[PDB]
């Protein structure tokens, strides 16, 4: 157990670097779509821009408004940041490359998803601003609404696999990736992940121009940074789940010796990178829904479809006795 901290740090530090550079990559791909260049002055090809923004942020004076909820105001970004970090303990990157081989890892991921709402709720309430509070309530409602669809899709995958172990879920896709028969389920899962991470076209907190003040409007300096970093770490995680559940995790595209020459971590990384490109591509492509429209989509479109897909998959597998 003495080397466990080394493993945990070898997970957490590169994740914080990967998030720093996800912000950069988002600014670069959006720029290129818009015929612009993006950050390219601060470091060669702009590669030192993350470091500069982080150092700027830590050198900013904290504000700490005169609220009766001094402690909760500072604790809310810690809460969300911690929740975003702790989900990676059960994520397998390759065969045997995982910190905790939880037999209940699927339900554990669902539980972390469910805990994610409290940081936003508490930030909104503790800010002593009715705009922040209302924006927070709307964001929390949206998150819990789309968690229902996320959970029912998790149930579909679990029915196919018959085990909550994430490594087992990956290794059950050796015959075929689950995203081929369940391609509509993959589509609905990617959309539900956009709505759960509060990302475009569902990013209410970004719609300040729209008279919608986000839950983190009062935050400055590093609390504001912790909210932003938690949100982006959640996007890489949701891209990793899309990869694990439907694109066969670390497995190669084809069971051929030429494809088995490159290791599984490279396959996993490439699929994660494809999904992160799509998160940015969608932000760059479409306008955003109003709150009532996306709430209607959550309850009236994605709950029914997810439930119907659970019924159809379980019934088809029970009929022909293809169950795990």
């Amino acid at each position: 157990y003495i080397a466990v901290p080394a493993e945990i740090l070898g997970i957490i530090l590169p994740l914080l670097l990967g998030v720093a550079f996800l912000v950069l990559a988002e600014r670069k791909v959006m720029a290129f779509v818009q015929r612009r260049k993006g950050p390219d002055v601060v470091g060669s090809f702009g590669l030192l821009q993350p470091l500069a923004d982080g150092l700027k942020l830590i050198l900013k004076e904290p504000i700490s408004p005169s609220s009766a909820n001094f402690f909760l105001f500072r604790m809310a970004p810690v809460a969300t940041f911690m929740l975003s970090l702790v989900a990676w303990a059960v994520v397998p990157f390759d065969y045997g490359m995982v910190l905790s081989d939880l037999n209940i890892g699927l339900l554990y991921l669902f539980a972390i998803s469910s805990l994610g709402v409290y940081g936003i709720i508490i930030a909104g309430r503790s800010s002593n601003s009715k705009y922040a509070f209302l924006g927070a309530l709307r964001s929390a409602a949206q998150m819990v609404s789309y968690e229902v669809s996320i959970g029912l899709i998790l149930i579909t995958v679990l029915i196919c696999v018959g085990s909550c172990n994430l490594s087992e879920i990956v290794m059950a896709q050796k015959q075929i990736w689950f995203g081929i028969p369940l391609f509509p389920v993959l589509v609905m899962f990617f959309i539900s992940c956009l709505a759960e991470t509060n990302r475009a076209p569902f990013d209410l907190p970004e719609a300040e121009a729209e008279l919608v003040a986000g839950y983190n409007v009062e935050y400055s300096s590093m609390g504001f940074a912790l909210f932003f970093l938690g949100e982006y770490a959640n996007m890489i995680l949701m891209s990793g789940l899309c990869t694990l559940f439907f694109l066969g995790g670390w497995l190669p595209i084809l069971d051929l010796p030429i494809f088995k020459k490159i290791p599984g971590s490279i396959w996993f990384s490439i699929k994660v990178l494809f999904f992160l490109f799509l998160y940015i591509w969608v932000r760059a492509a479409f306008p955003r829904y109003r709150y009532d429209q996306l709430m209607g989509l959550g309850w009236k479109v994605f709950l029914p479809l997810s439930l119907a897909w659970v019924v159809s998959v379980s019934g088809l597998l029970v009929t022909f006795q293809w169950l795990p």
């Binding site: 080394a6 590169p14 670069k28 590669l47 995982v98 081989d101 490279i266 990384s269 992160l276």
Partner: protein
């Protein structure tokens, strides 16, 4: 070809993920002498506890 500039932060993220996997894989292997076994159940735990005696007491 300017669009390769965008492929650098993405490649750095991919390398960060590859580190998050492999670095923890090689540290566990050094500490235990063999790679971590996926699916360690009660049987494997009991086998390890019995193997300790069968090895050390031999």
């Amino acid at each position: 070809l300017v669009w390769l500039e965008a492929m650098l932060p993405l490649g750095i993220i991919g390398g960060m993920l590859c580190i998050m996997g492999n670095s923890q894989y090689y540290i566990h292997k050094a500490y235990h002498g063999r790679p971590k076994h996926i699916g360690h159940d009660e049987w494997d735990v009991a086998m390890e506890r019995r193997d300790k005696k069968v090895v050390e007491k031999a």
